[PDB]
Amino acid sequence: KVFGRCELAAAMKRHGLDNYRGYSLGNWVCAAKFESNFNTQATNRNTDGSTDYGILQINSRWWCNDGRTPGSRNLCNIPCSALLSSDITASVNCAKKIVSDGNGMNAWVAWRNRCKGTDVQAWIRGCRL
Ligand SMILES: [Cl-]
Ligand SMILES: [Cl-]
Ligand SMILES: [Cl-]
Ligand SMILES: [Cl-]
Ligand SMILES: [Cl-]
Ligand code: NA
């Protein structure tokens, strides 16, 4: 599924991500924009052989099982395919664990490089929320 900007904001709010760990909704929408362009089916292979999955590009090295990332962990206790679904519940639940791990949203490289320090409220501006 390719979400619209306000549609994704609304779904993230319904799943409790707005202000989670102190990160306003625009931070989460901005991160999804630059991680996946709002496409739940996005996948990208990393040089180390791990793969990033879904709207928030969650990595199989630590967070989900894809069966092809040796020596990796599965800290969200989910198959990585669950992170590609049109319903964002699994991605949100796993993102909540990631952002609680100590480094906040710096876990998402695109957030650090393209969202952090910017006017992230622009990503939810105009949306009926
Ligand atoms: Cl957009
Ligand atoms: Cl915001
Ligand atoms: Cl594996
Ligand atoms: Cl959803
Ligand atoms: Cl933080
Ligand atoms: Na894994």
Side-chain angles (χ1 to χ4, degrees), residues 35-60 62-71:
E35 290 295 350
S36 67
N37 205 14
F38 301 147
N39 187 346
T40 66
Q41 298 194 75
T43 62
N44 293 291
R45 196 81 189 262
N46 305 131
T47 56
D48 67 358
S50 70
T51 302
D52 294 344
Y53 294 85
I55 204 142
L56 287 167
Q57 290 291 278
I58 290 173
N59 187 266
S60 65
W62 298 106
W63 303 108
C64 63
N65 176 57
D66 66 7
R68 65 168 200 195
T69 311

Coordinates of all heavy atoms in Angstrom, one line a residue, residues 35-71, unseen atoms left out:
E35 N 12.3 7.1 4.4 CA 12.6 5.6 4.5 C 12.0 4.9 3.3 O 12.7 4.0 2.7 CB 12.3 5.0 5.8 CG 13.1 5.5 7.0 CD 14.6 5.1 6.9 OE1 14.9 4.3 6.0 OE2 15.4 5.6 7.7
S36 N 10.7 5.1 3.1 CA 10.0 4.2 2.2 C 9.1 4.9 1.1 O 8.5 4.3 0.3 CB 9.0 3.3 3.0 OG 8.0 4.1 3.6
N37 N 9.1 6.3 1.1 CA 8.2 7.0 0.3 C 6.7 6.6 0.5 O 5.9 6.6 -0.4 CB 8.5 7.0 -1.2 CG 8.0 8.3 -1.9 OD1 7.5 9.2 -1.2 ND2 7.9 8.3 -3.2
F38 N 6.4 6.2 1.8 CA 5.1 5.8 2.2 C 4.6 4.5 1.7 O 3.4 4.2 1.8 CB 4.1 6.9 1.9 CG 4.3 8.3 2.6 CD1 4.0 9.4 1.9 CD2 4.9 8.4 3.8 CE1 4.1 10.7 2.4 CE2 5.1 9.7 4.4 CZ 4.7 10.8 3.7
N39 N 5.5 3.7 1.2 CA 5.2 2.4 0.5 C 5.4 1.3 1.5 O 6.6 1.0 1.9 CB 6.0 2.2 -0.7 CG 5.6 1.0 -1.5 OD1 4.9 0.1 -1.1 ND2 6.1 1.0 -2.8
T40 N 4.3 0.6 2.0 CA 4.5 -0.5 2.9 C 5.3 -1.7 2.4 O 5.8 -2.4 3.2 CB 3.1 -1.0 3.4 OG1 2.4 -1.7 2.4 CG2 2.3 0.1 4.0
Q41 N 5.4 -1.8 1.1 CA 6.1 -3.0 0.5 C 7.5 -2.8 0.3 O 8.2 -3.7 -0.2 CB 5.4 -3.4 -0.8 CG 3.9 -3.9 -0.5 CD 3.4 -4.6 -1.7 OE1 3.7 -5.8 -1.9 NE2 2.6 -4.0 -2.5
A42 N 8.1 -1.6 0.6 CA 9.5 -1.3 0.3 C 10.4 -2.3 1.0 O 10.3 -2.5 2.2 CB 9.8 0.1 0.8
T43 N 11.4 -2.8 0.3 CA 12.5 -3.6 0.8 C 13.8 -3.1 0.2 O 13.8 -2.7 -1.0 CB 12.3 -5.1 0.5 OG1 12.4 -5.3 -0.9 CG2 11.1 -5.6 1.1
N44 N 14.9 -3.1 1.0 CA 16.2 -2.7 0.5 C 17.3 -3.5 1.2 O 17.3 -3.6 2.4 CB 16.4 -1.2 0.7 CG 15.5 -0.4 -0.2 OD1 15.7 -0.4 -1.4 ND2 14.6 0.2 0.4
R45 N 18.1 -4.1 0.4 CA 19.2 -5.0 0.8 C 20.4 -4.1 1.2 O 20.8 -3.2 0.5 CB 19.7 -5.9 -0.3 CG 20.5 -7.1 0.2 CD 19.6 -8.2 0.8 NE 20.2 -9.3 1.5 CZ 20.5 -10.5 1.0 NH1 20.2 -10.7 -0.3 NH2 21.0 -11.4 1.7
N46 N 21.0 -4.4 2.4 CA 22.2 -3.7 2.9 C 23.4 -4.5 2.5 O 23.4 -5.7 2.2 CB 22.1 -3.6 4.4 CG 20.8 -2.9 4.8 OD1 20.1 -3.4 5.7 ND2 20.5 -1.8 4.2
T47 N 24.6 -3.8 2.5 CA 25.8 -4.4 2.0 C 26.2 -5.6 2.9 O 26.9 -6.5 2.4 CB 26.9 -3.3 2.1 OG1 27.0 -2.8 3.4 CG2 26.7 -2.2 1.1
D48 N 25.8 -5.6 4.2 CA 26.1 -6.7 5.1 C 25.3 -7.9 4.9 O 25.5 -8.9 5.6 CB 26.1 -6.2 6.5 CG 24.7 -5.8 7.0 OD1 23.7 -5.9 6.3 OD2 24.6 -5.5 8.2
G49 N 24.3 -7.9 4.0 CA 23.4 -9.0 3.8 C 22.1 -8.9 4.5 O 21.2 -9.7 4.1
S50 N 21.9 -8.0 5.4 CA 20.6 -7.8 6.0 C 19.7 -7.0 5.1 O 20.2 -6.5 4.0 CB 20.8 -7.0 7.3 OG 21.2 -5.6 7.1
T51 N 18.4 -6.9 5.4 CA 17.5 -6.2 4.6 C 16.6 -5.4 5.5 O 16.3 -5.8 6.6 CB 16.6 -7.3 3.8 OG1 17.5 -8.1 3.0 CG2 15.6 -6.6 2.9
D52 N 16.2 -4.2 4.9 CA 15.3 -3.3 5.6 C 13.9 -3.5 5.0 O 13.7 -3.5 3.8 CB 15.7 -1.9 5.4 CG 17.0 -1.5 6.1 OD1 17.5 -2.3 7.0 OD2 17.5 -0.4 5.8
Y53 N 12.9 -3.5 5.8 CA 11.5 -3.8 5.5 C 10.5 -2.8 5.9 O 10.4 -2.4 7.0 CB 11.1 -5.2 6.1 CG 11.9 -6.3 5.6 CD1 13.1 -6.7 6.2 CD2 11.4 -7.2 4.6 CE1 13.8 -7.8 5.8 CE2 12.2 -8.2 4.2 CZ 13.4 -8.5 4.8 OH 14.1 -9.6 4.3
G54 N 9.6 -2.4 4.9 CA 8.4 -1.7 5.2 C 8.5 -0.2 5.3 O 9.5 0.4 4.9
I55 N 7.4 0.4 5.8 CA 7.2 1.8 5.8 C 8.3 2.5 6.6 O 8.6 3.7 6.3 CB 5.8 2.1 6.3 CG1 5.3 3.5 5.8 CG2 5.7 2.0 7.8 CD1 3.8 3.5 5.4
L56 N 8.9 1.9 7.6 CA 10.0 2.4 8.4 C 11.3 1.7 8.2 O 12.2 1.9 9.0 CB 9.6 2.6 9.9 CG 8.6 3.7 10.1 CD1 8.0 3.6 11.5 CD2 9.2 5.1 10.0
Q57 N 11.4 0.8 7.2 CA 12.7 0.2 6.8 C 13.4 -0.4 8.0 O 14.6 -0.1 8.3 CB 13.6 1.2 6.1 CG 13.0 1.6 4.7 CD 13.1 0.4 3.8 OE1 14.2 0.1 3.2 NE2 12.0 -0.4 3.6
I58 N 12.7 -1.3 8.7 CA 13.2 -2.0 9.8 C 14.1 -3.2 9.4 O 13.8 -3.9 8.5 CB 12.0 -2.4 10.7 CG1 11.4 -1.2 11.3 CG2 12.4 -3.5 11.8 CD1 10.1 -1.4 12.0
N59 N 15.2 -3.3 10.1 CA 16.4 -4.1 9.6 C 16.3 -5.5 10.2 O 16.2 -5.7 11.4 CB 17.7 -3.3 10.0 CG 18.9 -4.0 9.4 OD1 19.5 -4.8 10.0 ND2 19.2 -3.7 8.1
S60 N 16.6 -6.5 9.4 CA 16.6 -7.9 9.8 C 17.8 -8.3 10.6 O 17.9 -9.4 11.1 CB 16.5 -8.8 8.5 OG 17.7 -8.6 7.7
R61 N 18.8 -7.4 10.7 CA 20.0 -7.7 11.5 C 19.6 -7.8 13.0 O 20.3 -8.5 13.7 CB 21.1 -6.7 11.3
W62 N 18.7 -7.0 13.4 CA 18.3 -6.8 14.8 C 16.8 -7.2 15.1 O 16.6 -7.7 16.2 CB 18.6 -5.4 15.3 CG 20.0 -5.1 15.2 CD1 20.7 -4.3 14.3 CD2 21.1 -5.6 16.1 NE1 22.0 -4.2 14.6 CE2 22.3 -5.1 15.7 CE3 21.1 -6.5 17.2 CZ2 23.5 -5.3 16.3 CZ3 22.3 -6.8 17.8 CH2 23.5 -6.2 17.3
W63 N 15.9 -6.8 14.2 CA 14.5 -6.6 14.7 C 13.5 -7.6 14.2 O 12.5 -7.8 14.8 CB 14.1 -5.2 14.3 CG 15.0 -4.1 14.8 CD1 15.9 -3.4 14.1 CD2 15.2 -3.8 16.2 NE1 16.6 -2.5 15.0 CE2 16.2 -2.8 16.3 CE3 14.5 -4.2 17.4 CZ2 16.5 -2.2 17.5 CZ3 14.9 -3.6 18.6 CH2 15.9 -2.6 18.6
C64 N 13.8 -8.3 13.0 CA 12.8 -9.2 12.5 C 13.6 -10.4 11.9 O 14.8 -10.3 11.6 CB 11.9 -8.5 11.5 SG 12.7 -7.9 10.0
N65 N 12.9 -11.5 11.7 CA 13.5 -12.7 11.1 C 13.1 -12.8 9.6 O 11.9 -12.8 9.3 CB 13.1 -14.0 11.8 CG 13.6 -15.1 11.1 OD1 14.9 -15.2 10.9 ND2 12.8 -16.0 10.6
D66 N 14.1 -12.8 8.7 CA 13.9 -13.2 7.3 C 14.6 -14.5 6.9 O 14.5 -14.8 5.7 CB 14.3 -12.0 6.4 CG 15.7 -11.6 6.4 OD1 16.6 -12.4 7.0 OD2 16.1 -10.6 5.7
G67 N 15.2 -15.2 7.8 CA 15.8 -16.5 7.5 C 17.1 -16.4 6.7 O 17.7 -17.4 6.4
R68 N 17.6 -15.2 6.3 CA 18.7 -15.1 5.5 C 19.7 -14.1 6.0 O 20.6 -13.6 5.2 CB 18.4 -14.8 4.0 CG 17.7 -13.5 3.8 CD 17.6 -13.2 2.3 NE 17.5 -11.8 2.1 CZ 17.1 -11.3 0.9 NH1 16.8 -12.1 -0.1 NH2 17.0 -10.0 0.8
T69 N 19.7 -13.7 7.3 CA 20.6 -12.8 7.9 C 21.3 -13.5 9.0 O 21.0 -13.4 10.2 CB 19.9 -11.5 8.3 OG1 19.0 -11.0 7.3 CG2 20.9 -10.4 8.7
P70 N 22.4 -14.2 8.7 CA 23.1 -15.0 9.7 C 23.5 -14.2 11.0 O 23.9 -13.0 10.9 CB 24.4 -15.5 9.0 CG 24.0 -15.6 7.6 CD 23.0 -14.5 7.4
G71 N 23.5 -14.8 12.1 CA 24.0 -14.3 13.3 C 23.1 -13.1 13.8 O 23.5 -12.4 14.7

